[PDB]
Structures are given as C-alpha cells and as structure tokens.
C-alpha cells in the first residue's frame, strides 16, 4: 500500500464523496499489474451495512465491456464474424432496412440509428422481432454512431446464437470463470444477496429493473475486486490462457470507427495516450448522434491508449479506465448515480499523478 497510492487516491475521492454526497464507494487501483482498494461509507444506510471488498455494485454499461469481449472470444472461436449480416443469425429479421446491417454496426452503434433503450413495452419475443422488424434507420449503416442499448444489446444475444448457450450460460462459461471472476454476475444469487448493496436514487433504495435485454446492455453487477481482475486482464491480455478469451479481448480493443478523438471498441471506447484531459472529461458528459470515420482495416488494440467505459443505473454510477502501456488502471463504483464527468476528472487526477 504506497503512501502515493493511498495520498492520490484519499485526497482525490474523499472531495468527491462529500461534494456528490455518494452514501457508499469503492476503488481499486491497478498499479504496476498490482491491485489497492480502498471503500468508504454504506452498501446499505437503513441497516447500516458497509461498503466492503466484497460489496456488489451494479455496472450499467460498464456491462457492455463484458459483452464486447465475449463478442469478441466468439469471433476467435470462429462462430461468428463482425461482418456477418444481422440476419445471417435471425433469419426472421426479413424487413429491407436490416440489408447491409452488420454484427460490426450493432456492436458499435453504427446500425443507422437504433434507439437509446429497447422501450419498455417489449415484454416478449415477437415483441422484440416487431421491435427491429419496424425500427426505421435515419441514417445509412457506416456513417453515424448513436450510443444505444437495443445495438450492442442484440449483437451480444445473436453472437452467442451459434453456441446454444444462453447468453448468461456463455458468459459465466467463456468469460467470468476463466478470469476466476466469482462473483461476477448478471443475475445476483441468493447466496450474495447479503452483499448486495442498495443503489440510492433521490434518497429512496433501488435496484436495476428487469428489461429487454438487460443482461446484455446494463445487466452485470460486480464487486471492486472482481473488477480490478477485469482492469488487470484487460490490461495484459498476453497473460490469459484460454487463447479465444485472449483474442476476444484483443478484439475488444481494436479501433473499429473515430469520432473526434475517440475510438470505438466493442464495449470499450478509447483514446489515444496521452490525453487531453478536457477531452475525456468533458467528452463522458452525456449520446449525441456524431458522424465516424471507418478505421479502414481496424487497428489492433493500440496499448497507448487510454481505455475506458463510464455506467450507471437508477442508483449506481461506476468508471473504469486503463492505460496498457503503464500496467495501470483504476475501477470507481458507486451507490449512487452522479455525473460522468466528475468521475472522469477524479479517475484523471488519479492516474494522471501515479503514471
Ligand atoms: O449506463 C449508462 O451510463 C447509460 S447511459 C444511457 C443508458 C445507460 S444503461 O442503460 O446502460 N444503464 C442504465 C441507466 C439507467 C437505468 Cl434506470 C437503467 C440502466
């Protein structure tokens, strides 16, 4: 536990808490490929239960790094191709608007326009085939990203078609337990419920709602130790065994489309290194529609590079970060939903004085 490391951190998140007013936190640094947590305040205010290594937060769209990397391990197994077209794997997806919509364009928000979220009507499976049979791009496929759930939500169910497996089955399989993430899950057994900390929206108690493809748009909740392992293998792919997992994450990282300075991954989104912090702050300020450039073929994971995914739900807010080249890395998970930018500004401090 480096005094610079526990300085940086405490000096940096303690503001944040108070400012935020964030009822319970926890951080992980991954410095030099080692791990420090540091946790403050309550999993839980009515029973007064605290935040600890083992708390579990729910990820958000942090989940969408998950979904990208098992997306990408499935690649490596050779069962899908990122320029298979959508209907290649639902066939009932018949409508003329789906010709030329590729794995690649859901994946990365680029389909032409799919919305935001999967509205909350679709209760079913001929709801959700209505859904995307009826859903009327604005724009051609390739030309415009709009962040959106109901994209990289479907690339995650179809890219695990091929298997057989559910898409939690695939996950828990090819992902979580070979990266000995054990209490990693997308639905929270009883057996951790104990652990599983309240997310507080305007004071009031709440956990994520179930919703059309939740598990592969915001469905993942995790504690800051299992995170920090996910920070780590992301970090140093070379270090996995299990080679499509290895592959799938080096997939995960490649620079497929640019907006501006960004880059976007499958799941992950990256920057070069070094950054402008302006640039990274201000840009996790939240969705717009921005027009991309087709990173014609895609770059291998670029280590340079600052990687990240901001999440959040009704009452969590989480951060990850990481920069290959240094072998460091930060995770910041929070009960409580506050702005994207304050998280990167702080994750940026903190980085920023251990790089
Ligand atoms: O996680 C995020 O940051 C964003 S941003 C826009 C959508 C998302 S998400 O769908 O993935 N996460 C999310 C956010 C709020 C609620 Cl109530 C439920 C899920």
Redesign the pocket.
């Known amino acids: 536990a480096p005094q610079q490391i526990n300085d940086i951190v405490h000096r940096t998140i303690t503001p944040l808490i108070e400012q935020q007013k964030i009822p319970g936190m926890a951080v992980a640094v991954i410095y030099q490929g080692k791990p420090y947590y540091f946790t403050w305040g309550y999993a839980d205010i009515a029973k007064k239960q605290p935040v600890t290594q083992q708390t579990l937060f729910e990820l958000?769209?942090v989940?969408?790094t998950f979904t990208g990397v098992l997306g990408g391990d499935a690649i490596a197994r050779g069962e899908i191709k990122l320029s298979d077209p959508t209907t290649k794997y639902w066939p009932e997806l018949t409508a003329k608007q789906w010709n030329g919509i590729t794995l690649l364009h859901l994946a990365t928000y680029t389909a032409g326009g799919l919305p935001?979220?999967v509205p909350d009507e679709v209760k079913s499976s001929s709801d959700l085939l209505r859904f995307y049979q009826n859903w009327q791009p604005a724009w051609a496929p390739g030309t415009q990203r709009l962040?959106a759930?109901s994209s990289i939500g479907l690339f995650g169910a179809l890219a695990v078609k091929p298997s057989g497996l559910s898409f939690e089955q695939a996950m828990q399989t090819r992902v979580f337990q070979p990266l000995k993430l054990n209490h990693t899950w997308i639905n929270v057994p009883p057996a951790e419920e104990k652990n599983y900390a309240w997310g507080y929206r305007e004071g009031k108690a709440v956990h994520?709602?179930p919703g059309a493809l939740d598990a592969e748009?915001?469905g993942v909740k995790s504690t800051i130790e299992d995170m920090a392992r996910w920070v780590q293998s992301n970090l140093k792919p070379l270090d996995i065994n299990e080679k499509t997992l290895q592959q799938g994450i080096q997939l995960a990282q490649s620079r497929y489309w640019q907006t501006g300075d960004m880059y976007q991954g499958l799941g992950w989104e990256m920057l070069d290194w070094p950054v402008n912090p302006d640039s990274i702050i201000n840009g996790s300020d939240?969705?717009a529609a921005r027009p991309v450039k087709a990173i014609t073929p895609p770059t291998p994971a670029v280590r340079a590079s600052w990687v990240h995914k901001?999440?959040?739900?009704?009452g969590f807010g989480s951060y990850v970060a990481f920069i290959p080249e240094k072998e460091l890395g930060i995770v910041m998970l929070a009960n409580k939903?506050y702005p994207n930018p304050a998280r990167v500004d702080a994750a940026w401090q903190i980085l920023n004085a251990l790089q």
């Open positions: 958000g769209s989940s969408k935001l979220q962040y759930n994520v709602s748009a915001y939240n969705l901001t999440g959040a739900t009704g939903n």
